[PDB]
């Protein structure tokens, strides 16, 4: 018995087709993804194969002006039009609190929404009961397939789930659910969740009875053969994990932003044992036509959003590189721009720090340089604030050591800077990688760069996320000796662009490698 | 017979008292120089000593809004009110052409104006004849003192004297004039001129019959004992030169901007032999009251100039360091500001170069940060343009080698930069001091810094002065493969400040030393 798993993850409000970098579609002929193109490819596989499952591994919420305006009603609507079979809860599903998950998605979806490790407590327990499930048994032709859900335990440190939700360890919470399915004679079991590739592999290893792991969160790209685009594979597709009980468990993910549609074909026997598995993510490029019916509906919903592109806030003559392969690895000019908007809005305060992972999209300069509220909404979607903090030289030094402590894994904590010249030597031990740290003086008439002093105290502009110890920056949370709340992150960057009129941020050497 | 020489040089339109850096007087209680304070000290010496000469060694023209508006009529007026005895022609006396020297100064001055090495030719010869003199014999009590003038041969490469004026070698032109004075039994001879301290010393050495050299042009500060201000002495006051014929010849200069009044007391015998000489420049600080009559007249002339301070073009929250001790020696933030105003006005063009000597004044931030047309007029008084040029990598490399070829002598050619990261190793041979030269790419979507290539061609924004080979930049003149004239230098910097509203240029590491 053959099963075709079609899967998406970390779509992040990219309901419309995008450029290859996942920012707004400028050159339509080379545009990718979007739900209309996705609907065409799904329909094609559904005609060709009898046993198909369309699954989402979370983080449909947050990313573009679609979520800013419709707040998830678009997620429920277009995921229903595409006829998704199940969806696991992601951390961005809690960005608008539990209320913002319950009303526009949980109550509106025509498919089960899953998470076995999210437990409700207090006054919320009665309210959210039944709206999401730990598992769902789905009929697939003449057979039955069990789907178990999970969500990152990191969700309270990344989102706004509130005080009445407990995030248990995935493996601990999944084993009694899979055991329960085995007792009901459900011999075909999919773990569908949002915890990242490292967790996906451990679930595949330790959770007895799991046949396949369909994951997300870490935007992992997997491929067998020669990849079709810019994305570099982190492993073969599917990634094989040998479970503690000796089974070959396929582990899958399909990058992010709806650029690819994951496609895994599984061969099961009568007892639900995985005989074989093969496939690859399918690049949703312009070679696949967008569905005309879906595009017509997308275009109807577009009318309300056209108000966030009406006004040209300013222009860029440079590509604004806000991509994760740049901003989580090195100095990126989008990071320089935002840190310059931060320092300018507060002018003394000479220094700025900014987690690269907080930068959610690039902006393309080819559309006559035009920067709109919509272009900016994709770069900064969280609605955070840029705060003023006072830090010891030693604290700021520990933050920069933390910035590169696990360098190479595309992690969010890598800092973008303003009024700071940092030099890292990656060849050294984590916690001893900063080889130079020069800072811009405030207590001077002519601002110039001087070596940071451990026994000195500096005023840093940073997002509230970092001021509250986000991205594992516990030293900032624990050691800050002053914290003032500032202006809204999007309004800070918008006013600066308006004042500058024409912008051209460069990669200047604020961050260097030895 | 005792003679007191009171001398000024390179006053540069600083008719009003200034701050200690020579920019506009903000804090009146610690303000210096100006003609009113100078008049008080001169009057004091004139009461104390019977044989006094008040001399000017040139460059009264150019420097502040006083010259911009009155075009030299203020020079003639206040130099007459101070009762100057003689003045040697400087190169800035030719900034407004020969017409701009003849009409507001030559025809209006109540004292001889001298230069023995400036020779008139063509249609101008008949026009300028007698308006300036090669020498002047002046009665000083019961004795007679001969004063010979000279001007820098560099004047045609620094100013606008035109095609009908020949600048001969000073020593060649001075010897027949001094010889002529010796035949008329003038045994006391002063050489008063504008060629710089190195030339002043050679005239003292080689021109037989010269008793004293009163110079200018190089803003040389000389002192005996402990100096009273920021100015570092380049030698003792007077500087003694032993002439080829064995005489001890005192050589004097009194810095610039009317901050100091040079004071040299000479002891002559009956045959005009210099027995002894002593003195020092007198710091014209607030301890010397300004003359009330002169200040009243200065205040009358001020009314017309108050129109150039009426409008606040923008604000600075940083001291704008446009001083020669910074801009001719290292990266200065005034240079960064002007190079940023240049790149911004032309936006691809990523690179800017700017001779430090072209920056004529700092701007102080303490007057509520206020930048006016008057503040800017002192920084950029020449009315030049910022031009676009196309240069080979090899040409730009030779220009940067030329920038530091004679480093240490406060020379004008030291370049301020935009979109360029240069590293100099001064320990190396002149012409091989550039150890790193990184440039900002134009042919890229994300501008970043890359090592300059000799076989590449770049678009540089620079003042017309450098495009025409000024400051010995013959390689730019001879090798530029494109030259387009740009916008007026003051209007470029003014528009940028207006657009930015609040400015804070830093010393960023654009220029470094190894
Ligand atoms: C509480 C949260 N605050 C944030 C602010 C900022 Cl400035 N950055 C953030 C977060 C959260 N994550 N991040 C970065 O995103 C990275 C993770 O991104 P990914 O690897 O792509 C995997 P996900 O798609 O689940 O974020 C972190 O490492 C962080 O660098 C927030 C608040 C309000 C909202 F409406 C939405 C979210
Ligand atoms: C033809 C001249 N162009 C100039 C433009 C610029 Cl951008 N800079 C310049 C000059 C001349 N000199 N300089 C710098 O001044 C330095 C010399 O200054 P000082 O040592 O102080 C001794 P002086 O007071 O006689 O200038 C030179 O080395 C140069 O760096 C010009 C044109 C129009 C005018 F209304 C006035 C002058
Ligand atoms: Ca099974
Ligand atoms: Ca003599
Ligand atoms: Zn995600
Ligand atoms: Zn996630
Ligand atoms: Zn001068
Ligand atoms: Zn001069």
UniProtKB/Swiss-Prot annotation, chains A, B:
Record: residues binding IMP: 328, 355, 360, 382, 465, 471
Taxonomic source organism: Homo sapiens
Location of this chain's protein in the cell: Cell membrane
Binding site for AMP: 328, 355, 360, 382, 465, 471
Residues of this chain annotated as glycosylated in UniProt: 27, 285, 307, 368
UniProt entry keywords in alphabetical sequence: Cell membrane, Disease variant, Disulfide bond, Glycoprotein, GPI-anchor, Hydrolase, Lipoprotein, Membrane, Metal-binding, Nucleotide-binding, Signal, Zinc
Chain residues that bind Zn(2+) 1: 10, 12, 59
Activity modulation: Inhibited by adenosine 5'-(alpha,beta-methylene)-diphosphate (AMPCP).
Protein's UniProt name: 5'-nucleotidase
